[PDB]
Amino acid sequence: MKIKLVRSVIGRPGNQVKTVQALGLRKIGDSREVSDTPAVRGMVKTVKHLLEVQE
Amino acid sequence: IQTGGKQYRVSEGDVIRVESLQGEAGDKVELKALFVGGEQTVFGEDAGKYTVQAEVVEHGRGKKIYIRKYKSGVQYRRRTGHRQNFTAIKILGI
Amino acid sequence: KTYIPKNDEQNWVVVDASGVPLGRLATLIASRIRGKHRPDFTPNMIQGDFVVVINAAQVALTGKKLDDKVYTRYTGYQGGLKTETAREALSKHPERVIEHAVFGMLPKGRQGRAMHTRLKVYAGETHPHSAQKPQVLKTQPL
Amino acid sequence: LWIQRINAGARLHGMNYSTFINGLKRANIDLNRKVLADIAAREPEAFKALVDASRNARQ
RNA sequence: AUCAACGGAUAAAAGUUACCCCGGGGAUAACAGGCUGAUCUCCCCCGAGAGUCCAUAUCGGCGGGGAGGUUUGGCACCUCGAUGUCGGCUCGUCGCAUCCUGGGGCUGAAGAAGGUCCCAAGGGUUGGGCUGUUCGCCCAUUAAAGCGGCACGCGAGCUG
RNA sequence: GAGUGACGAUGCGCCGAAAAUGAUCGGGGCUCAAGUGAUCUACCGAAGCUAUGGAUUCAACUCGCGAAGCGAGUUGUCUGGUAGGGGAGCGUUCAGUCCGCGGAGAAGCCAUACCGGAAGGAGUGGUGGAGCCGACUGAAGUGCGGAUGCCGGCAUGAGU
RNA sequence: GCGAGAGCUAACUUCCGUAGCCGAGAGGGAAACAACCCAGACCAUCAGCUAAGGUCCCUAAAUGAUCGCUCAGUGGUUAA
RNA sequence: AACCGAACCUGGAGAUAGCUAGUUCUCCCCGAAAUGUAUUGAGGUACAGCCUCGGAUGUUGACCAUGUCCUGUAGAGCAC
RNA sequence: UGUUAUGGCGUGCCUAUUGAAGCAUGAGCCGGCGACUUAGACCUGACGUGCGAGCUUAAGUUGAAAAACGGAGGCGGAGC
Ligand SMILES: [Mg+2]
Ligand SMILES: [Mg+2]
Ligand SMILES: [Mg+2]
Ligand SMILES: [Mg+2]
Ligand SMILES: [Mg+2]
Ligand SMILES: [Mg+2]
Ligand SMILES: [Mg+2]
After folding, report:
1. Is C37 in Cβ contact with D11 (below 8 Å)?
2. What chains are in contact with A, requiring at least 3 Cβ pairs below 8 Å?
3. CATH number (domain holding residue C107)
4. Which structural domain range is residue C97 located in?
5. Are B51 and B29 spatial neighbours (Cβ–Cβ below 8 Å)?
């Protein structure tokens, strides 16, 4: 699953900032290839709105 | 420009970002994005058919600027020096 | 490195207000006066054309001429020094109706103020040829 | 200042900045962007060529 | 051990200051401004009923909806290394929710005299007796003797 | 001789809609939409992301060196900041040691476009007229814009 | 902002809970404007893409395209 | 003896001052708190919470998923 | 390098604060003066050196363009 940070963590709740950290994203634009497992899929759903998700 | 120029120029000695190839000669080739060197008005990739040659002239340091930063009533004052590293290149090219 | 200045070029232009809605005519003038297609294109100085206006009297106005469109000149210390004309009431000085729309759309600085000197308004048609001894290239609105 | 000198010339040939730059984007080949205003200011003949090229890649 | 002021200062303890003093506080009150608008001022909806009869010429029970910011407040935001405070006088200017004049509609408007509402801020809006008075009551007039804002307008302008 | 009427729903608009220095949606001006519902691209736009160069923090991976430990060296990574904590240094006086300098011109003063990542430090000229840089180590009465700060000189108010 | 009490389902009010920002946060936007929207500034560039916001003229960029609505300047003061 | 709710001068004396002011070169790294309990306490202070530096441990921390237990709010209901 | 015109941008400094261009505080200007120190055979921690299961001396004595002597005493060494 291709993930990219499109929105800033500033002004977003602690947990959502903590999730974006767990996904390995540090800057807006940071894109990475991601695992298709309940835990990794769950993190991505938890910051769904801050990310541009491919497939 | 954003390092690695272009355009029809008449063989001038312009200054750009550092080029690694030390001393004189070194020789550099540039893609070219537009030209009028022969009245032919050609642009983009069709300009890539052509390539400008330029010789490295001098490696240098820019004029001394001072980084001054200040925030009121928060006792914040910062003075730090700066000099921008460059490369002078004499254009020759096709 | 970007391109520098040339001034020895003052271009005169004739614009007709007839039936043109004020604001829409104003925009055109205000733009040619500052720099639209711009000669050297630089903002540091006055590059704009000179705009002569004809038939100032016949300028168009929508829902309100007699209504709402109110000029509001408010005089020296306000010992009730609050004077106000209607737009129909500018059957007095119509050459001002264009002027106040144009200056209104121009910068307000030292240079800006020197810009109104380039706007020459006249209420007639074939007769306003006063400030028309130099060139006078005619430009229609749209 | 550059953007200003651009749709000043783009409009001179019946175009505009929004439109002219979109064409030069569509004709990928054009990556000019920087010093596209010098062409507009100093070389009109050459600037037309770019307006013509943009009009094509768009329509 | 009502060490109950309950983590309990000494075994052992009240007042007063306009004769007051120092260190501070706009961390906190009085004035004024600010936010609010309960209270206050005004306007509007409805129509019980009053009006010989007829709700609406006038008046409007019980109830309802707003406006204003002139009252008493609420709150405590700049000002406590100082923003002088009532009333008079002097000098003005502004709002109109108009006291007089000006124009109108309705009238339970014959006329004359009016009532009420609409438009209207151009000018005008008296002199005294009582009280520090603002106010208010009174005398004598008047076209009328308006209501409110301007730090409850105005003390580097005067009074006190 | 042709459709005509009553309830309701809902979009946008109308009345209701009076405040004190001069008015206004920021203005100009806009319905010949520059208002407003729905849709669609395109461009502008930040210190955000990117390009190119360069420095720092930590970390692992090389090698200098009798060993840590610290140099350099790539690659990744970091670097908004008040109280505060930690690190590396600049500058002044005095001292000890070394190296020197000076009447063919010391310090101090004055000017300056040069250097260093900063505190800072040189070159040159001018003035001065007899003392004095640089380095290593030691020690402090060691760095000022504030304190209604202290001393002194000189301004403003004013040719009042 | 949300969840409550006090208050008049007043206050730029007070007092808890909770999330964010300011405090200690520069930069764009909101005319101006600690806080709201966007976004967290290592330094240099007369390069490029975007966000929130924008694209008549002041003022960067469509006086864009289609079907509609509103003629009151409504837009650019609230109610029965 | 030109300021008397207790004169003046010198000393104790650098009284005390939970208060006001002031606190001076540079760059680099991290970076708070205005909360809890107690207090003749309430603009003071103790301990904790939160910062930083050195050391030890060295994945125990963070987010997300699955499993499992706990709860009487929102809604709702009328059996008390 | 000095100066100048026009254009863009642009709310002195310090202090005190939730919040300062603030019509809150301070300051006429310049020069100089001017605020975290010193003591203690005191306690506790870092770093460094010397010896090391041991480590040190105090007063003093003797020399001194200079240091030697002096184990009285002090600390580790066993706790409850
Ligand atoms: Mg008050
Ligand atoms: Mg008073
Ligand atoms: Mg006065
Ligand atoms: Mg001073
Ligand atoms: Mg209501
Ligand atoms: Mg004292
Ligand atoms: Mg004070």
Report:
1. yes
2. none
3. 3.90.1180.10
4. 1-142
5. yes
Task: Report H helices in C104-139.
Answer: 110-115
Please indicate if any CB of chain C lies within 8 Å of the CB of D8: yes
Q: Where are the alpha helices (DSSP H) in B1-94?
A: none
Torsion of CA D27, D32, D36, D42, to 10 degrees: -100
Q: Which two tokens stand for residue D10?
A: 């783009």
Taking any CB pair shorter than 8 Å as contact, residues of chain C touching chain D are 2-3, 35-38, 40-43
Cα-based distances in Å from A11 to A23, A26, A41, D15: 19, 15, 24, 42
Does the nearest atom of strand G lie within 7 Å of C24's Cβ? yes
Domain that holds residue B49: 1-94
Interface of D with B in 18-57 (CB under 8 A): 27-32, 34-35, 39, 43, 45-46, 49-50, 53
Determination technique used: X-ray
Spacing of C-alpha C7 from chain mean position = 22
CATH says A1-55 is which class?
A: alpha beta
Give me the number of domains chain B comprises: 1
Distance of CA C120 to the CA centre of its chain: 7
For residue B40, the cross-strand partners are none
Total count of domains within chain C? 1
What's the token pair of residue C21?
């809605």
Contacts of B36 in chain D (CB under 8 A): 43, 46
Q: Select from D5, D12, D11 the least CA-distant residue to C42.
A: D5
